[PDB]
Design a protein around this ligand. Structure first.
Ligand code: HEM
Length: 147
């Protein structure tokens, strides 16, 4: 399980990106710009991104909705990342948000390297970039097991 120290480093270094509603949305938008630039065929899987392609998805109203839900799901797991039983419970809930959707388990896991690089570019030092990678490597398989 991640240590309380690692939880503290993550919360401290990601704090300026998740401290206001506007910051939450800008952090999420960056994650989707990375995910869809690598895999633009994933836009079609999200119901509110109907009618859009890579040329115009980032300007949509629907992408702002998912920017908040993705980022706030991540911050909920970060807040409990040193509590093994709670983060496993939370991650199971977020994985279950994907079971009946159009996304495959392989597509879901393809987000790991993209979100790791993106979130690592938001933090300031190597310790925090390593914690971001450890965090995502721990929660991605918990969520993916529900898919
Ligand atoms: C850190 C990893 C991830 C987290 C925490 C996460 C979290 C979520 C959450 C909370 C929802 C529900 C959205 C809502 O309330 O509207 C959702 C939906 C969904 N996610 Fe993820 N997700 C992650 C990775 C991915 C990846 C890599 C994909 C790949 C395409 C993906 C595809 C989807 C799809 C297709 C939906 C359903 C959206 C709809 O049809 O409106 N997720 N995800």
């Amino acid at each position: 399980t991640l240590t309380k120290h690692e939880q503290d480093i993550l919360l401290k270094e990601l704090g300026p990106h998740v401290d206001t509603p506007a910051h939450i949305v800008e952090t999420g938008l960056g994650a989707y710009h990375a995910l869809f630039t690598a895999h633009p065929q994933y836009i079609s899987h999200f119901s509110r991104l109907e009618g859009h392609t890579i040329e115009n998805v980032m300007q949509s109203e629907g992408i702002k909705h998912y920017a908040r839900t993705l980022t706030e799901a991540i911050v909920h797991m970060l807040k409990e990342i040193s509590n093994d039983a709670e983060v496993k419970k939370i991650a199971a809930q977020y994985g279950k948000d994907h079971t009946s959707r159009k996304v495959t388990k392989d597509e879901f896991m393809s987000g790991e390297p993209i979100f790791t690089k993106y979130f690592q570019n938001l933090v300031k030092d190597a310790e925090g970039k390593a914690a971001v990678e450890k965090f995502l490597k721990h929660v991605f398989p918990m969520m993916a097991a529900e898919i």
